[PDB]
Amino acid sequence: NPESADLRALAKHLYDSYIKSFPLTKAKARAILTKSPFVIYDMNSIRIFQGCQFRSVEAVQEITEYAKSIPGFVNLDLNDQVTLLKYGVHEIIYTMLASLMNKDGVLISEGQGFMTREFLKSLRKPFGDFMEPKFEFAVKFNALELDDSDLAIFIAVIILSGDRPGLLNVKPIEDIQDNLLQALELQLKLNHPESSQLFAKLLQKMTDLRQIVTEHVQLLQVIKKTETDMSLHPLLQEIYKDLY
Amino acid sequence: ADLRALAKHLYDSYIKSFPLTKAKARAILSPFVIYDMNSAIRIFQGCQFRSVEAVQEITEYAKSIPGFVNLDLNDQVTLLKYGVHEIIYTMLASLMNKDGVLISEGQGFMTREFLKSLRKPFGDFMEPKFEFAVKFNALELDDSDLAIFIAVIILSGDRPGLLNVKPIEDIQDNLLQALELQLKLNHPESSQLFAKLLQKMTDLRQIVTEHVQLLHPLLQEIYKDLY
Ligand SMILES: COc1ccc2c(-c3c(C)n(Cc4cc(O[C@H](C)C(=O)O)ccc4Cl)c4cc(OC(F)(F)F)ccc34)noc2c1
Ligand SMILES: COc1ccc2c(-c3c(C)n(Cc4cc(O[C@H](C)C(=O)O)ccc4Cl)c4cc(OC(F)(F)F)ccc34)noc2c1
Numbered sequence: 001n002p003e004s005a006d007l008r009a010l011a012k013h014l015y016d017s018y019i020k021s022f023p024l025t026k027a028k029a030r031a032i033l034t035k036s037p038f039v040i041y042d043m044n045s046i047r048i049f050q051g052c053q054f055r056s057v058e059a060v061q062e063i064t065e066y067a068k069s070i071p072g073f074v075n076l077d078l079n080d081q082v083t084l085l086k087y088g089v090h091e092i093i094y095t096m097l098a099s100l101m102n103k104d105g106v107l108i109s110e111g112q113g114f115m116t117r118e119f120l121k122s123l124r125k126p127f128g129d130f131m132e133p134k135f136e137f138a139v140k141f142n143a144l145e146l147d148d149s150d151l152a153i154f155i156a157v158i159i160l161s162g163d164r165p166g167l168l169n170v171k172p173i174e175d176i177q178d179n180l181l182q183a184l185e186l187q188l189k190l191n192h193p194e195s196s197q198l199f200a201k202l203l204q205k206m207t208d209l210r211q212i213v214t215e216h217v218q219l220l221q222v223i224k225k226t227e228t229d230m231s232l233h234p235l236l237q238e239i240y241k242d243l244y
Numbered sequence: 245a246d247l248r249a250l251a252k253h254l255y256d257s258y259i260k261s262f263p264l265t266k267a268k269a270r271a272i273l274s275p276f277v278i279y280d281m282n283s284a285i286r287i288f289q290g291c292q293f294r295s296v297e298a299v300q301e302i303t304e305y306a307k308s309i310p311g312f313v314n315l316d317l318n319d320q321v322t323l324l325k326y327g328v329h330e331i332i333y334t335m336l337a338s339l340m341n342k343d344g345v346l347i348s349e350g351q352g353f354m355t356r357e358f359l360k361s362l363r364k365p366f367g368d369f370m371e372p373k374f375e376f377a378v379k380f381n382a383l384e385l386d387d388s389d390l391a392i393f394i395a396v397i398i399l400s401g402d403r404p405g406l407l408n409v410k411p412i413e414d415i416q417d418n419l420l421q422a423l424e425l426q427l428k429l430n431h432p433e434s435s436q437l438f439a440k441l442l443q444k445m446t447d448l449r450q451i452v453t454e455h456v457q458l459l460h461p462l463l464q465e466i467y468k469d470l471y
Contacts, residue, residue: 140402161443163379163443163447177436178435178436181436181439181440182435182436185436185439196417197417197420197421197424199439200420200424200438200442203439203442203443204400204402204442204445206442206443206445206446207445207446207448207449208402209446210446210449210450211449211450211453214450214453244450
């Protein structure tokens with residue numbers, strides 16, 4: 001079908017841009033998780049929290065590079081470009097994060113290490129429940145068995161939302177997302193012919209994404225007030241400033 | 245097919261469970277208009293009483309969903325527990341516009357501005373549901389589309405504490421196909437309506453979590469727990 005075909009080209013472009021933007025893919029991660037990592041499972045080896053903040057900022061930079069390649073995005077009103085990244089970039093971080101996680105832990109340091117879930121639950125202060133909600137999401141989301149060619153359209157869909165608070169020209173945004181959603185649907189149908197209504201089920205997962213970020217926001221307010229000693233990068237700080 | 249039967253059954257059960265349908269609401273949107281004090285803990289508490297009403301109507305509707313009464317009883321309980329609130333806001337949208345909501349089974353209409361003017365705690369009580377209703381109402385769904393949507397919501401295998409997820413997702417699968425087909429047939433030129441509707445569930449839950457945040461002995465007993 002002539003319409004399908006355009007969607008197929010779009011998928012390929014997105015997938016290719018994803019590969020260029022994100023050095024550590026789900027495929028490399030799974031290969032590593034199943035070359036092999038040094039494992040950290042207890043103290044014998046705030047610093048960790050600052051590491052996750054460091055990686056986040058880097059991920060924000062990587063996701064911003066990717067977004068620029070989504071057809072139409074850079075042509076949007078520059079203020080709406082800022083708004084979509086502000087409300088979308090963390091939802092994308094937790095998505096990509098699941099790629100690095102299994103039930104028991106998460107890859108760190110470009111894949112060269114693996115820090116266990118339990119170690120992270122045992123941390124002091126208001127830090128023990130810092131990563132947990134992500135592991136809980138990752139486990140449900142990883143069950144969908146998406147791969148990078150699927151994820152690549154999905155995260156695009158997440159960026160191009162016409163319901164983000166305070167958008168000026170919603171119309172141009174909903175036209176692009178309309179496209180990304182058809183592309184994803186086709187992609188999921190072709191790539192997972194036997195998985196029933198996977199499209200429906202992935203989109204429902206978008207719900208837990210939003211719960212993670214708003215819950216992470218609270219947790220940040222807690223941690224910053226208990227530890228007046230703790231830096232928050234201006235980049236993340238600005239993303240959370242308005243928000244919800 | 246099974247899927248049009250499923251869709252007709254759900255619509256039929258929806259008409260019978262819910263007195264004031266979107267179709268009836270939209271016709272109106274004449275009601276007594278409450279635009280100011282001349283026309284409150286009483287309003288907030290009244291809303292909580294209406295919520296208990298709606299839970300009952302929604303629960304009765306759930307029993308008509310093919311397969312639902314067959315699930316483990318504890319699991320029907322936890323599905324309704326986490327489902328009814330998301331369904332209340334979905335149904336409340338039917339009764340709202342940008343300027344106010346229909347109250348009193350359609351005979352009253354209270355303005356969005358009067359509600360926003362209530363003393364500090366209660367002034368933002370409703371405003372998040374108005375903001376959602378405006379977005380959701382742009383999809384222009386009607387009752388037959390909504391009948392299936394809310395069944396979908398009820399059949400969510402991700403609710404915490406479910407004993408047996410498999411049959412629940414099996415059923416939501418049927419409903420989702422049924423929903424998807426309903427929206428292709430009813431809304432031909434609404435390109436990705438199915439997907440856009442499912443995305444709205446993201447705002448739905450966020451309303452619920454935010455509302456939990458903001459939140460006579462025999463009366464206290466009736467209208468406790470299930471909010
Ligand atoms: C763009 O997509 C992406 C999303 C997430 C991530 C990542 C990435 C990884 C591997 N972790 C786990 C992690 C990283 C650590 O960092 C140090 C530096 C180390 O790794 O040695 C230490 C301990 C733990 Cl548990 C986190 C945590 C995080 O914070 C939060 F959002 F709050 F969840 C954001 C990003 C990452 N990396 O690359 C991406 C890309
Ligand atoms: C089952 O589907 C349904 C969902 C919601 C509703 C309703 C319904 C209506 C019309 N309102 C608005 C309303 C009702 C009031 O109460 C009085 C008694 C009145 O209703 O006149 C006063 C002021 C306002 Cl803004 C609310 C508020 C509510 O609480 C909460 F969820 F917390 F928001 C729950 C239900 C309703 N009615 O019927 C249904 C059915």
